[PDB]
Design an enzyme around this catalytic site. Structure first.
Site, short mmCIF file in Angstrom:
data_model
loop_
_atom_site.label_atom_id
_atom_site.label_comp_id
_atom_site.label_asym_id
_atom_site.label_seq_id
_atom_site.Cartn_x
_atom_site.Cartn_y
_atom_site.Cartn_z
CB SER A 205 47.10 32.46 84.07
OG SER A 205 47.74 31.58 83.59
N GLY B 63 -0.91 47.94 39.80
CA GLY B 63 -1.70 48.34 38.60
C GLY B 63 -2.07 46.87 37.92
CG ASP C 85 10.50 52.14 44.22
OD1 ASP C 85 11.11 51.80 42.90
OD2 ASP C 85 10.21 52.89 44.09
CB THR D 23 6.05 59.00 38.19
OG1 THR D 23 4.38 59.52 37.52
CG2 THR D 23 6.21 59.04 39.33
NE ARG E 269 1.85 52.15 50.67
CZ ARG E 269 2.48 53.24 49.82
NH1 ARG E 269 2.44 54.50 50.21
NH2 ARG E 269 3.72 52.93 48.98
CD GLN F 31 8.20 65.86 41.29
OE1 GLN F 31 8.71 66.02 42.38
NE2 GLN F 31 7.24 66.15 40.29
CG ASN G 182 5.85 51.29 47.27
OD1 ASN G 182 4.72 51.12 46.73
ND2 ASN G 182 6.90 51.50 46.30
CB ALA H 178 44.30 31.66 80.25
#
Ligand SMILES: [Mg+2]
Ligand SMILES: [Mg+2]
Lengths: 442, 442, 442
Positions: B384, B145, B109, B84, B14, B78, B212, B364
């Site tokens: 200049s 949760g 994260d 997890t 996301r 993995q 996330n 300049a």
């Protein structure tokens, strides 16, 4: 009769500064100046400021402040760093021994405290014949000892006293605890003497907020700033993003002007009505007429006339005056110069120490180089890449060719030139660069 | 002995990114680097990171991070996106089968989690001989949760475990629910086995906040930024507007410098003391001495000496070195160039790949055009509109006329010129433009 | 069948403006346009707007809005400033006397109210066969009279009615109180008639927030802005500082682009994917392709191609088109000009009303001066300080010397020059300036 004492004698240790805490600024004034401006609005009969490191300070009180305010501010010194109780004792010496009236005590690190808050304190105190009244406020997270019994809803650190009660409670005061004499202990001493201890409560907590460090300084700078913006918005000024618009006190702005995000307006700047202050503009002591646009500009000590257009990416140095309907465009800088009604300096130029008339046009990528000054007439048109080697006079309606260096005067209606004529070298790139640009040409 | 596993194997859906979630940055470091820097401060005996899409990632761990940190970080892969619980199983394979110590599990994260928070978790866990301890925190709106019984005050997602308890609760784990194996289910399994489930509570909620999506990323970028500003303010740096001042970690700034609004200081930038960083300045890897002013400047990989003045509207490209008391003014750009003590480049110029001596002045609207390099001596004054066509040497105290093109060397104390002389064409504007400028002239 | 009436007839006194309150803007649309866009999404069968000062206004409804929305919006006038009750009476005259359906009443100063909120009101109202339903919301500090009994949780000021109940409760209404006829009094009249008074509650308070002054205007501008940013962040755009990023509605931005602080994107601007919008950028109606960088740029009505680089400090005026892989560097300005694929304008130049081909390079500090137009070919290299006096044609692969003024056409592969040759005046500074630069030279 009330005498006001401002206690400005502490060291300010956690500021971690070589500049005395009380001389640190926000919204245009030092904390001390903000404190003395509010009290001077109150107009007590006697106003006295007590100091520790005092040489830097004493100069700016009265000297600068008592004048600006047009009254007397006496100064009392505090030779040993004894504490707030003693500081108050030092301030009382500046009163005639037989002093009659009330005594109000304040600090020099509450830059939001105002005359009303002071007036209400004095009023509650006389109302109940008090001896001592103490200002308080209530907070979310108290740190700010804490509050009538005594003091360890917190204590503001602002007190009204009866002079006789105060002189007496002070005569009997000690030290052991930091190892100094606190004024908070006067509250517990008068409680022993069975005296009335009153307490005026302030709902608006930010009016009595103090500054001990640079985190708190930025906080109060932020709160004061919200309140100056909201006052302008309610008088008829659109502020697209009040969080990124810093406006100093004194700065004035008028009806229907629009202020775009990332703008600081500082010192004694004035904006007329119907203006557009674009984004990313910083102006200190700049005066702007009505209907002017000032976008992505960094400027100071200057004035910009009605319906004029400055920006984006323009730099104004002290002494710039631009007339009404004038224009300074992108990548221009102007120092100590006067530019008349309707004249345009649209691109990539610098104008230093010159005067220019009205309805003139200065061509892109030019420079005014240096007690005589260059002077340029009205309805003049100068071509791109012209260098004006001071001093030089250009008469009305005169013109200049592109890529000219002007070292001598130019009469009204003459064309000044210097650049050589164009020569083309055919097939140069084939011979001097075989590869790339060579092909094409093919 | 404690082994720390960082779970960095999820997809980060996301974020809506082609850049792996964990490599997204704030305040100067990627989330993963922020996670590994805190843990490396903890110094566990074994540190292991578990990956999914792993080719981009594995390179930056250890490679770059294990070195920068001077320790070993093992990597475990993995192969199937199991969840997890399985990720933790994959990380355990990198331990000797007979591994004795505790196992702490974290994600990649949470860019604010720090060594203390990790240390307290480990401490509570050993204190009560625990099996499992879980970090928690309490919020306003729980989403996250929710929390000792079990897990659907919320769960941080950071755990300490007994290795034997963990290996066993994991051996007996399922899938049906997303359709993966959660580690949260280890808490309910050990509860069945009547095991002690402990929970260390974190008051500071932002230390364990995770990312996330890009809304949460900006939030934590913002919170981390407030905390770096407040640390500088408390050490003696004035930040007028902490909300619009982005300071990266590592950046150092010194006593009594003032930072004005709209400023980002990035990478390994250093500011000396008593400086002014005006508004709208962006510096990445720039070093500034004491008493220097850097206002409306965009710069990188460069250094600016003591008491020097840069701005407003100046652009510094990599390899710029400006000496003490030097000056770069409005609308100047400098790339890969050295400029000596006291030398001034005040207006509308570009200086690329050159070296300039001390106490020189560049006029300049000039340009250094292109392995040889242009070299300019000390006490030199160029007029200049001079173009310096590389390579060329200008000797000490030499001068240049306005509007000169330099293609050849100039000896100490010579004046170099090229511009033709000024001619005026009288009454040109009357004849070539009858109307307007013509009248005046009249 | 539902008829919607928008009451836009009040004076807007505390705006302190000469611009009618309802025509004041935020995020790209006026409040009225924001109100009518939401309602047009609802698509009632009859939509009617009631006006007071009506000449400025009536023009922009339907004229501009009924078209843009492709439907009819009837307008009803309110000759005497009688109040909201009367305004509603004025709006009903635009319905056929025998009108059957419901009547929903809203104001023109709630710029966040959306079609869903309106739809839910209509739904609750039909659900309970109501007569009157009134929208409400609950706040922290109610000011916002206050809420079913009656009205002095506050009243939103949005109502659904039965047409027969409404026409009747209105026929019997008075004045004494301001000295006008309120619509709130219809609630108390129908309560006397023992009628059902329903009330739809809105959790999101900001959807029904109204604007009476410029403090409230900035507030809702701010809230709307947070919600447009968060929608872009969730679709895959990194916004480093959502507080200083103003994005108008309609503006579109794509995957993985990064927006740095101090940026406004306005009007119908579009950003492709993988872009970098640096800090301090303001773009109105600018279209940017994928992989382009636009840093410290102020631009409008222009387009910038794929992988192109603009900034820092660049000014784009209407009609600029820059091709893919092109470059506009620091201190450049471009107006009404086309610049081909791969061409670079890196420094201190102005390009006005010209066309440039592909893979060309324009040297630092140049100017395009003025129905013919200058045209420059592909693979062309122009030297620094060249003035292109329009109109002029430069052929493919042509070159120009430093400090050239071009007044005539240049063939493919020719070198154009004009500058005179360099002369050195030995020992000039000793003779013309004895002191300083003189010594050295020694
Ligand atoms: Mg020039
Ligand atoms: Mg020239």
């Amino acid at each position: 009769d009330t005498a006001v004492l401002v206690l400005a004698a502490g060291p300010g240790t956690r500021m971690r500064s070589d500049t005395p805490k009380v001389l640190h600024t926000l919204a245009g004034r030092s904390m001390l100046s903000h404190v003395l401006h509010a009290i001077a609005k109150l107009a007590p009969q006697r106003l006295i400021v007590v100091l520790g490191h005092d040489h830097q300070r004493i100069a700016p009180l009265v000297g600068e402040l008592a004048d600006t305010l047009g009254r007397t501010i006496d100064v009392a010194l505090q030779d040993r760093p004894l504490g707030t109780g003693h500081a108050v004792l030092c301030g009382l010496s500046a009163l005639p021994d037989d002093y009659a009236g009330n005594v109000v005590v304040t600090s020099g690190d509450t830059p939001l405290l105002d005359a009303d808050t002071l007036a209400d304190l004095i009023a509650t105190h006389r109302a109940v014949s008090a001896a001592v009244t103490v200002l308080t406020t209530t907070l979310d997270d108290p740190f700010y000892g804490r509050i009538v019994m005594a003091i360890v809803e917190v204590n503001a650190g602002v007190y009204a006293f009866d002079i006789a009660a105060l002189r007496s409670a002070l005569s009997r005061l000690s030290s052991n605890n930091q190892q100094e004499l606190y004024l908070t202990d006067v509250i517990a001493i008068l409680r022993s003497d069975g005296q009335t201890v009153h307490a005026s409560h302030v709902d608006d907590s930010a009016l009595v907020a103090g500054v001990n460090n640079r985190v708190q300084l930025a906080e109060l700078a932020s709160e004061l700033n919200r309140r100056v913006v909201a006052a302008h918005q309610l008088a008829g000024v659109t502020v697209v993003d009040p969080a990124t618009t810093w406006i100093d006190v004194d700065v004035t702005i008028g009806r229907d002007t629009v202020i775009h995000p990332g703008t600081q307006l500082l010192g004694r700047t004035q904006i007329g009505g119907r203006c557009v202050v674009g984004p990313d503009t910083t102006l200190t002591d700049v005066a702007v007429g009505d209907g002017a646009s000032v976008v992505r500009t960094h400027g100071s000590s200057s004035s910009i006339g009605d319906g004029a257009a400055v920006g984006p990416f323009t730099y104004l140095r002290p002494g710039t005056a631009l007339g009404a309907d004038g224009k300074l465009g992108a990548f221009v800088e102007v120092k100590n110069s006067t530019i008349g009604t309707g004249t345009k300096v649209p691109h990539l130029t610098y104008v230093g120490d010159a005067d220019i008339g009205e309805y003139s046009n200065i061509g892109a990528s030019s420079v005014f180089v240096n007690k005589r000054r260059t002077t340029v007439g009205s309805h003049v048109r100068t071509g791109s890449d012209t260098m004006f080697v001071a001093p030089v006079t250009i008469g009305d309606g005169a013109y200049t060719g592109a890529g000219t260096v002007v070292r001598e005067d130019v009469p009204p209606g003459a064309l000044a030139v210097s650049a050589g004529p164009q020569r083309n070298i055919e097939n140069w790139v084939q011979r001097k660069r075989p590869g790339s640009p060579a092909a094409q040409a093919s």
